[PDB]
Write a protein that binds this DNA or RNA. Structure first.
Ligand SMILES: [Zn+2]
Lengths: 145, 65, 101, 83, 149
RNA sequence: GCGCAAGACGGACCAGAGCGAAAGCAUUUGCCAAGAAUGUUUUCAUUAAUCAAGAACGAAAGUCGGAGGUUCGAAGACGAUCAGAUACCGUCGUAGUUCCGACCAUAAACGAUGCCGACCGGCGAUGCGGCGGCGUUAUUCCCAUGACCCGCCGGGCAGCUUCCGGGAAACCAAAGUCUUUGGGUUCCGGGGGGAGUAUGGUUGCAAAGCUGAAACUUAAAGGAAUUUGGCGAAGGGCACCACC
RNA sequence: CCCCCCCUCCCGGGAGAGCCAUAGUGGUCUGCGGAACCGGU
RNA sequence: GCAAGACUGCUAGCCGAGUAGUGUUGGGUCGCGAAAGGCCUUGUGGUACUGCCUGAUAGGGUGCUUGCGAGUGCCCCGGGAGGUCUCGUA
């Protein structure tokens, strides 16, 4: 966003996952649940968060498929949408980026979905920055210590 | 080959029997289901038999799919 | 005469399946009839593995794996020696090929 | 198999079969006598009520409509009445 | 199986063998008929009257507490509906389908279902005509929907 | 590498799994209408099965009138392979591929098997609804519910085995209960060409669609399965007249 | 003499929501009987 | 009112105390949890472990050792000694 001299300053712009990890996560005999939410933070940083989830097999399960009902999938997607939209509008980007360093949102979604169908991993596989507010210098120089 | 001597040493081993019965053991491990089955044929309790705890855990038939 | 109990596919109560494209060829074939091959492969096999391993910036690193799925038409699947003809009674065996390597 | 006794089947066999495949058609449903510790008047309900019921005396909702039986409200005692 | 759909099913009632009122039912015939009259005045149909009586009042079915069926009792008192309940339901369903079809002209499946429903209506109306319950000049017409609500 | 615009499209998840009369159907959400199955001690009481006339839907290609034309690509233009290619191949490439209407009503539209109903073996799985029962999990207690497991019931796409039975056989729980031949009802086949041709009718702007012969000609044309025949098919064995 | 280490073996002790016998203890379930019954508030 | 059996949770002094607080999806009489201080008889014995994280020594994740498969071993502090821990091989 700005360079002072012989030293350039940056800002958060997005986050992605390794393509190999995403390829290895999508396997057979499990249902993938997708959800994109267009939710803005306290300031005008609009993000389109995506989500990926899978079902697995219990330790005593014999059924190889382990699928889910369509209504259960819809309920899970609604839960994920609500969880992500709840933890965005209440806080600024500066520390929700820190929140994004661990899978705290993913862990919250995983814990919230134990009642519908037990999912194992919740990942925000992509975050885009759709709109940004008017360029500011004070926030930038506060960001870099 | 149809041998009639049948490996003399192993034939003797076949002839050898132990002094113990190897079956008339003093302790019998049986589930309550077998005890209930026995209780309703002709006889009831025994003095050389005891019920064991129910071995039903989760299930048999390990996951194959 | 009829060769297989099925029609060389898995469509039993549908009547139509999505058409896909072959990988080796460009032929358009039904999904359930087209032989699907899934392969797990690394970036380097046995030659550049050392060169990446000992000559690297970071230590204790696991090499990435390239993931891709293959669709083969019958002619392309046989010409590439993926499947081969079997006996009349040997075609009824649906067990997957043994995998130990 | 070849020599069964279809005239006198065991009760287990008869209860295994469908209600309309038995030797004589007999429903497997029954009536109930539901009551709660709150109110002190007793009503009569059907097992597959399929209709929301209010206790006579406006106490609380008793039964719940489902696919099969009725989800009895928690804290209620019922007995199988028969003749 | 089903008359129109190619599906086969087996799910309906199964009346018990013993044709006698249970002893635990203290309700007489007169009060049951009074409840039937009250429910009819409330604005229900014999389809739900039996349901309400077998759920709340605990009576198995009318045909044992009294001799006449529900529709028979309603005809006897005189407040029975002039049109059969099933024909009314079929006509209402046909009107609903046609109202859905007026705006969306590309829904071919709705057209097929409407054709099937009109066929069912014609087949039931023929039986009503031959069993002497509707006038011989009664005809089901596409536009006549407002009067037959 | 960063942004913009346009069109098509819905990968992996995707299965001998689901729905629909068939053709056919996949990004999230919102609205409208419909349906099979399971549950029922609700309702009417023969309202039932198949169908000449007639009627709706009907893949892509096909035509007419508008809007758009990203990509693929009949016709056409070009270059090499070739003895000869206006074929295989490669680069451009109009009509079409997209949507809104107006038409045709055609397939290997195949399960090459019409529908309804009864009966005659077994064995595990899967999807729906209902029902009974130990035990784990949404952390440790109490209940309802999801998820897991052990069974049962009804309908549905299918799977495995067999001297039920049948067929010429391939094979079939139906392609069975058929000379010991009769459950009900529609369409349709009479050796192979000529020939789905000419003609007459009929529908369509057209392309073409439905009905549809005769004259002449032949003793064969065809269905299933074995041993050698050959493969520009696969997989094995041997040989210093093969190699290292 | 090297190292910093890291690992393994033979002993002592600390922590835990393990199990088993004994105390502080709290509830769930089962057997018998109410001199004999039919209605009205 | 007689009346003995079958089982269960917590404390390993008792009291305050299942008080605050945490807490879960729908609820409930609820899971989780030491005390400040006091009154005193002044606080039961045998028994093995323990890779990292999350939320018990439960449950769910996920490893290290030699390419690979099975072992031994992997909480902390205090003593001693030693230095390629055992069997098979895409
Ligand atoms: Zn190909």
């Amino acid at each position: 966003e700005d360079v002072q001299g012989k030293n350039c300053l940056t800002n958060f712009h997005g986050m992605d996952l390794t393509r190999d990890k995403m390829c290895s996560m999508v396997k057979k005999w499990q249902t993938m649940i997708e959800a994109h939410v267009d939710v803005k933070t306290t300031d005008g940083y609009l993000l389109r968060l995506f989500c990926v989830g899978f079902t697995k097999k219990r330790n005593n399960q014999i059924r190889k498929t382990s699928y889910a009902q369509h209504q259960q999938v819809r309920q899970i997607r609604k839960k994920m949408m609500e969880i992500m939209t709840r933890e965005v509008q209440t806080n600024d980007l500066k520390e929700v980026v820190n929140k994004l360093i661990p899978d705290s949102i993913g862990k919250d979604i995983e814990k919230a979905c134990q009642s519908i169908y037990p999912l194992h991993d919740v990942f925000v596989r992509k975050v885009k920055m759709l709109k940004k507010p008017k360029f500011e210098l004070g926030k930038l120089m506060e960001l870099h210590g | 080959i149809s041998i009639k001597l049948q490996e003399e040493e192993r034939e003797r081993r076949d002839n050898y029997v132990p002094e113990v019965s190897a079956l008339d053991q003093e302790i019998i491990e049986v589930d309550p289901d077998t005890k209930e089955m026995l209780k309703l044929l002709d006889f009831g309790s025994l003095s050389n038999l005891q019920v064991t705890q129910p071995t039903v855990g989760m299930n048999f038939k390990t996951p194959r799919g | 005469t009829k060769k297989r109990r099925n029609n060389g596919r898995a469509k039993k109560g549908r009547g139509h399946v999505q058409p896909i494209r072959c990988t080796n060829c460009a032929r358009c074939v039904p999904k359930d009839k087209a032989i699907k091959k899934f392969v797990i492969r690394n970036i380097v096999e046995a030659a550049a593995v050392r060169d990446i391993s000992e000559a690297s910036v970071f230590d204790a690193y696991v090499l990435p794996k390239l993931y891709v799925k293959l669709h083969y038409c019958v002619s392309c699947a046989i010409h590439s020696k993926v499947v081969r003809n079997r006996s009349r009674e040997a075609r009824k065996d649906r067990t997957p090929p043994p995998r130990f390597r | 198999p070849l020599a069964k006794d279809l005239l006198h089947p065991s009760p287990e066999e008869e209860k295994r079969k469908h209600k309309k495949k038995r030797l004589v058609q007999s429903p497997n449903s029954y009536f109930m006598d539901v009551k709660c510790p709150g109110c002190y008047k007793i009503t009569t309900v059907f097992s597959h009520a399929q209709t929301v019921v209010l206790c006579v005396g406006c106490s609380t909702v008793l039964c719940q409509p489902t696919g099969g039986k009725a989800r009895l409200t928690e804290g209620c005692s019922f007995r199988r009445k028969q003749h | 199986g089903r008359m129109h759909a190619p599906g086969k099913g087996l799910s309906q009632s199964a009346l018990p063998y013993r044709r006698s009122v249970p002893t635990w039912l203290k309700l007489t015939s007169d009060d049951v008929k009074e409840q039937i009259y009250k429910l009819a005045k409330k604005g229900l149909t014999p389809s739900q009257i039996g349901v309400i009586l077998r759920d709340s009042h605990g009576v198995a079915q009318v045909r044992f507490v009294t001799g006449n069926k529900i529709l028979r009792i309603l005809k006897s008192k005189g407040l029975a509906p002039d049109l059969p309940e099933d024909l009314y339901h079929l006509i209402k369903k046909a009107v609903a389908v046609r109202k859905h079809l007026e705006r969306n002209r590309k829904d071919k499946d709705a057209k097929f279902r409407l054709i099937l429903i009109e066929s069912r209506i014609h087949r039931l109306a023929r039986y009503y005509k031959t069993k002497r319950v509707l006038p011989p000049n009664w005809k089901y017409e596409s536009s006549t929907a407002s009067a037959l609500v």
